[PDB]
Amino acid sequence: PPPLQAVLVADSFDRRFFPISKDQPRVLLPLANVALIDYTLEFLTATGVQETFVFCCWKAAQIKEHLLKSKWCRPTSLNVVRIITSELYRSLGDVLRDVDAKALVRSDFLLVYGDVISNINITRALEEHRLRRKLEKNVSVMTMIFKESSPSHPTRCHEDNVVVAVDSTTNRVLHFQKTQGLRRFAFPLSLFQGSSDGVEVRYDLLDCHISICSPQVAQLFTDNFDYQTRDDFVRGLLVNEEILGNQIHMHVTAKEYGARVSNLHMYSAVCADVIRRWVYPLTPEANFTDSTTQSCTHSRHNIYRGPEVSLGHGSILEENVLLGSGTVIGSNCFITNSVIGPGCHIGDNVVLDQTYLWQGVRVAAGAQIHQSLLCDNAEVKERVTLKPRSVLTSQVVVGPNITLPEGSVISLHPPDAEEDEDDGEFSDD
Template sequence: MRSSAVPQKAVILVGGEGTRLRPLTNGIPKPMMPVLNRPFLEHTIAYLRQCGIDFTILALSYLPEVIQAHFGDGSKLGVQLAYAVEHSPLGTAGAVKNAERYLDSTFVVLNGDIFTNLDLADMFAFHRRKGAKATIALTYVDNPCAFGVVETDDVGRVRRFVEKPKPDQVPSNWINAGIYILEPETLEHVPADRHYMFENGLFPLLLELGEPVYGYRFRGYWLDMGTPEKYLCLNCDLLSLKEKSALISGLSKDGIYCDGDVTIHPSAQIVGPAIIASRCQIGRKVHIKGPVVMGPGCSIADEASLEEVVLWRGVNIGAGAILKQCVIGDEAEVEARAQLINRVLPPRLS
């Protein structure tokens, strides 16, 4: 999918506090949450690089120093990174306005909690062919009532936006996918240093002004990982190869991937897919059924059972405990013989 026919720069909106993901985001920025044991934001940056975009601006607000310390100048990921830090939340459009000094040509904007395989080169070709000032990626959902719905005409030009319509007032099943291609002059309409949104601010204003705003429909993979359920789903989808990450290659459908210093008792049973990170210890008669992701330094005591779970760093699972469809944060402990079904345990804050 790598192509030179894409905008040269992208802005990723990673300033939110991740309130829908609490308690997992207590003390950790949402973009740093591990997906297959790598920060989610690394997957997004790798996707953009695969598409041909090597210069990315990160729009930060919540715990910016954590993200800056991890990513630095981006050279470890083979990209160039710049930062636009908000002293108070500026909203989606306001955050991009805050990065305006970097944006001197057509650029891409992505919401920081979206995982997708959208072909940006094809979307950019659509944008140029239509002569658009703004192009909004649209994804199809069966029930659009919880989303911002975008109504377009026969050639894709946006007619109107309907936020979270009632079931009997749904004009379309195509929703705003949180991915945009914009011309830099659109930012002239965004006020500086104040909270302002794309969804109910800039985009409706551009329509009022008669500017060409288009919707680009695609039916590929799209997931908003902004809730614990969707976060778990993303990990499972990637491990099960329902979708691939540009960051990680070489996975197989039922593979079991262990770092070299993992200790596994001979009586333990592991059915993939599973990723087991360094220093993990798996005890006697433990049963693991994938998809399962275990972060570094996890300990699974004797006769525990795990199915469809994501464990972060340093998690301790007691003897005989049963976990299914769970996400367990850093350093958390699960008592012996506990039964956790569809549960989330927050990280233990130091």
């Protein structure tokens, strides 16, 4: 049983965190005061993975610097993250091309993205996948790891839903398609025509992007120089089943958990879903990134607490908070479902709901905040109010006596936002 590689392709190439990602890659956003790269690194370590050949192109300097001050840097570790960086590639296709180049892996890696949030022990799937190999001698190329969920869960936004026509006797995939604005579907009869002994149209599956693979996946990505992702990879491999079949094999795990954030929406879900211990072991206060900055103390209603918080007087914490180090909160305050971060300084009489505060932010009095991200040091003056998903990032300020509309993406760059940084709502420069 040779070791288990893990081709951690740690830079989501299709840009969807704008303007957020322009500062630090999404692979370094703080999910709950922890970097997504660390969540996936701890996941890969948990399932017994020797090497984690993390690949990065954009801002790879920052990622390498953050991974050198990690728990996976010191050579006593078992997950020898052998970072590898180039600027050329911009798609997982190009990344598997890079794998063809350096010929790193030898068998059975895990094409994990950078932002996977999971505790999925893949030993069962790996074992039966190697049995699938040894029986019919390597035609079974990939082996995705989907999760049984329900098509109305918040971690299934109107974008990521997938429909999979899959065999049932052996969980072999037959047809895959997204649901980016459909009301019907279409399944070529080739599935049945091959073997109509029984299929299934599974649409409770949630994509998890934990694809086991093979060196043959490197071969099949270097043969077709037009493939540009894993979605498109399987979507193009599933059609030519009679020329070197190379048949995928689905897999379900119903008791585990695993997601992959791809926007502020799915990010809100996976964050305020990690707070509720849904992914345990990888809860916050386990402090798997064993550093003194965010170690935390549980409580009723999961209202966590870091060191030196010094909450106010008569301020309540309904549920699912995660206070941070040194983050003072004034009196008569009110927080709920938020995820505060290390270093904040919240005012008095403030009200926070589902909100986010990454670090250094300085929210002021009277400030009503709901369902909104607030990235690094996005200080905020008095008598403000926000509205759903009103993400304001990157040192931006907001002046006194000022509201914001519903979807208010603002930033320090005027063009990338829908506003511009200043000490006011309008007239930012």
